[PDB]
Design an enzyme around this catalytic site. Structure first.
Site, PDB file in Angstrom:
ATOM      1  CG  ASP A 102     -17.453   0.270 -41.649  1.00 18.80           C
ATOM      2  OD1 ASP A 102     -18.248   0.901 -42.374  1.00 18.80           O
ATOM      3  OD2 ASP A 102     -17.825  -0.547 -40.782  1.00 18.80           O
ATOM      4  CG  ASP A 114     -22.611   2.883 -38.887  1.00 17.75           C
ATOM      5  OD1 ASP A 114     -22.800   3.887 -38.172  1.00 17.75           O
ATOM      6  OD2 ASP A 114     -23.102   2.769 -40.034  1.00 17.75           O
TER       7      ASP A 114
HETATM    8  O1  LIG Z   1     -24.856   0.887 -34.798  1.00 17.54           O
HETATM    9  C1  LIG Z   1     -24.934   0.477 -35.962  1.00 17.54           C
HETATM   10  C2  LIG Z   1     -25.990   0.882 -36.864  1.00 17.54           C
HETATM   11  C3  LIG Z   1     -26.057   0.429 -38.140  1.00 17.54           C
HETATM   12  C4  LIG Z   1     -27.097   0.733 -39.131  1.00 17.54           C
HETATM   13  C5  LIG Z   1     -26.814   0.668 -40.493  1.00 17.54           C
HETATM   14  C6  LIG Z   1     -27.798   0.941 -41.429  1.00 17.54           C
HETATM   15  C7  LIG Z   1     -29.071   1.281 -41.021  1.00 17.54           C
HETATM   16  C8  LIG Z   1     -29.364   1.350 -39.674  1.00 17.54           C
HETATM   17  C9  LIG Z   1     -28.386   1.079 -38.731  1.00 17.54           C
HETATM   18  O2  LIG Z   1     -25.128  -0.434 -38.646  1.00 17.54           O
HETATM   19  C10 LIG Z   1     -24.088  -0.876 -37.853  1.00 17.54           C
HETATM   20  C11 LIG Z   1     -23.173  -1.728 -38.454  1.00 17.54           C
HETATM   21  O3  LIG Z   1     -23.413  -2.218 -39.694  1.00 17.54           O
HETATM   22  C12 LIG Z   1     -22.066  -2.148 -37.713  1.00 17.54           C
HETATM   23  O4  LIG Z   1     -21.100  -2.855 -38.357  1.00 17.54           O
HETATM   24  C13 LIG Z   1     -21.910  -1.734 -36.394  1.00 17.54           C
HETATM   25  C14 LIG Z   1     -22.838  -0.892 -35.807  1.00 17.54           C
HETATM   26  C15 LIG Z   1     -23.948  -0.451 -36.535  1.00 17.54           C
HETATM   27 MG   LIG Z   2     -19.346  -1.378 -39.775  1.00 17.36          MG
END
Ligand SMILES: O=c1cc(-c2ccccc2)oc2c(O)c(O)ccc12
Ligand SMILES: [Mg+2]
Ligand SMILES: O=c1cc(-c2ccccc2)oc2c(O)c(O)ccc12
Ligand SMILES: [Cl-]
Ligand SMILES: [Cl-]
Ligand SMILES: [Mg+2]
Lengths: 294, 294
Positions: free
Chosen positions: B25, B27
């Site tokens: 993964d 983010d």
């Molecule tokens: O910084 C992040 C931003 C996002 C994000 C996902 C879709 C749309 C907008 C923002 O998702 C995250 C996430 O799901 C995690 O597990 C950890 C960090 C983030």
């Molecule tokens: Mg994630």
């Protein structure tokens, strides 16, 4: 236990004769849109002549009480007092007045997902709303509740803002109702408050306090100033998962009418599965079939 | 069974040494926003030097593949091929191409709740979108799927329109992912696709087909053109209910990293409750703690 018996004949006379009052849902029961159920106005006239009390309990959060009364009048339901009419908008305003946390020296504010009728009801109950004018040059008050109602202007931005307020664990999350959708005259459907509440609950990781049917709170709201004996009251509605469940939870005899959302086949399926709290005691094709029992 | 063991020392060398590849993964794992996890670029370099394959699997539906690659590069993750990058946008486009009903002589259209990156991915897979230009003076094509993705312009009107299309039982309901919310750099959160899908499901009375993790379909998508042996692949993520559950369903060894959403305490609670499909085999503070095993 409830067996979903078609109410007629001697049984109908006995049930109605023993009842001291009747609680009606409105949409799907008294009318469909701007069309009254034929015979429904005459039923209410006959109930009043028979000395039986009528009250109206609706999850519809769109209209404040004065505008709610108007729909009754133009569809033939005359002689009604505003004190007979209870909506989830009225009862959500009262619950918030009763439960808003925070100190008396600095009243909190309510962030509302909903329309002008709901907002009017809240202000009439003394509540201050997020986004109303701030005092002098002072800052905006602290938001101490999010209220989800029927919001035809729901948006991602509003959902995100609701979640920002709910980051504070002491901020309440309240929903007027959990009705998932509603049928319209043209055969289409409109999303219900339950669909918007699902989004707010999911994005915030919270569970909402639900004001409207089938929550027992709706029964506390209607009986705050009216003594009704649930053992002597009929609950008449068109939705199994809201009106009929409500009646069971409150100890009322329940009557499903078939002029609305729920179908007889669904009631019989719940009965076969043993889910008796979703089974009406009785059903009628329409509430006009109740009049002969008087 | 999974016991959520901190991966280190000889065990770390054995686990990494036996692995033929690693699925990450993005983010919360490689980066948080515009900040790379320190040591994460070096891990990927060392994995490649060790002859171990790296693939990237994200539920983020905001970016089409060309723009997805850009984020990797500017945060230090060099030398990556676009074929290593899988998002729920890419895989939802492929699923729709594979499953859209209707006849080949008249291709259906997809009603999309989502942004321009998602729409670009769909068009690149050959799909026609509701609201794209109609041919000549001809009428608009029949909508044969509703796709719910991350939609910062979600509205009540769009929800109502989605329900109108879903009135046709043969119209598909698909969601890119069910992630309920996401953390932002400033400590706030943004609603996730799961919150919008909940509203669409509730208002339409449908259950959505979910493309992204933890659905096994995501694993079919990534392996359509890449032979990976799940028994020889590590799944590395920050979210128990999406990455770790995904790994269990696919037969992969799972590693939770703590630089993202899920907390160690949550993993240990699932283990005590016996919910082993939500329990990582291993955890690390950050993926930089994996590099020493090479
Ligand atoms: O910084 C992040 C931003 C996002 C994000 C996902 C879709 C749309 C907008 C923002 O998702 C995250 C996430 O799901 C995690 O597990 C950890 C960090 C983030
Ligand atoms: Mg994630
Ligand atoms: O005609 C109807 C309109 C509505 C409606 C409720 C809130 C907002 C907009 C429309 O709700 C109904 C309902 O819940 C029923 O049980 C039966 C009929 C209707
Ligand atoms: Cl407000
Ligand atoms: Cl579209
Ligand atoms: Mg009704």
């Amino acid at each position: 236990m409830a067996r979903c018996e078609r109410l007629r004949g001697a049984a109908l006379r006995d049930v109605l004769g023993r009842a001291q009052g009747v609680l009606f849902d409105c949409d799907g029961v008294l009318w469909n849109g701007e069309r009254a159920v034929p015979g429904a106005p005459e039923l209410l006239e006959r109930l009043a002549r028979a000395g039986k009390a009528a009250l109206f309990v609706s999850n519809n959060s769109r209209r404040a009480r004065p505008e709610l009364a108007l729909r009754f009048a133009r569809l033939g339901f005359g002689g009604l007092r505003a004190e007979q009419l209870f909506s989830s908008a009225l009862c959500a305003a009262r619950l918030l007045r009763q439960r808003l946390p925070g100190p008396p020296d600095a009243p909190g504010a309510v962030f509302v997902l909903g329309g002008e009728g709901l907002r009017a009801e809240l202000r009439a109950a003394g509540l201050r709303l997020a986004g109303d004018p701030s005092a002098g040059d002072g800052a905006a008050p602290r938001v101490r509740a999010v209220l989800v109602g029927y919001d035809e202007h729901f948006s991602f931005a509003k959902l995100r803002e609701a979640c920002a307020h709910l980051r504070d664990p002491e901020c309440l999350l309240v929903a007027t109702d959990r009705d998932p959708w509603h049928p319209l005259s043209d055969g289409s459907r409109t999303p219900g408050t339950g669909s918007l509440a699902a989004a707010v609950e999911t994005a915030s990781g919270r569970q909402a306090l639900v004001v409207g049917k089938p929550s027992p709170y709706m029964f506390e709201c209607i009986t705050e100033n009216f003594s009704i004996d649930p053992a002597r009251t009929l609950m008449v509605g068109d939705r199994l998962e809201t009106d009929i469940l409500f009646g069971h939870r409150c100890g009322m005899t329940t009557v499903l009418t078939l002029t609305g959302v729920s179908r007889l086949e669904e009631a019989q399926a719940y009965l076969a599965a043993g889910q008796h709290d979703l089974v009406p005691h009785y059903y009628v094709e329409s509430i006009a079939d109740l009049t002969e029992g008087l």
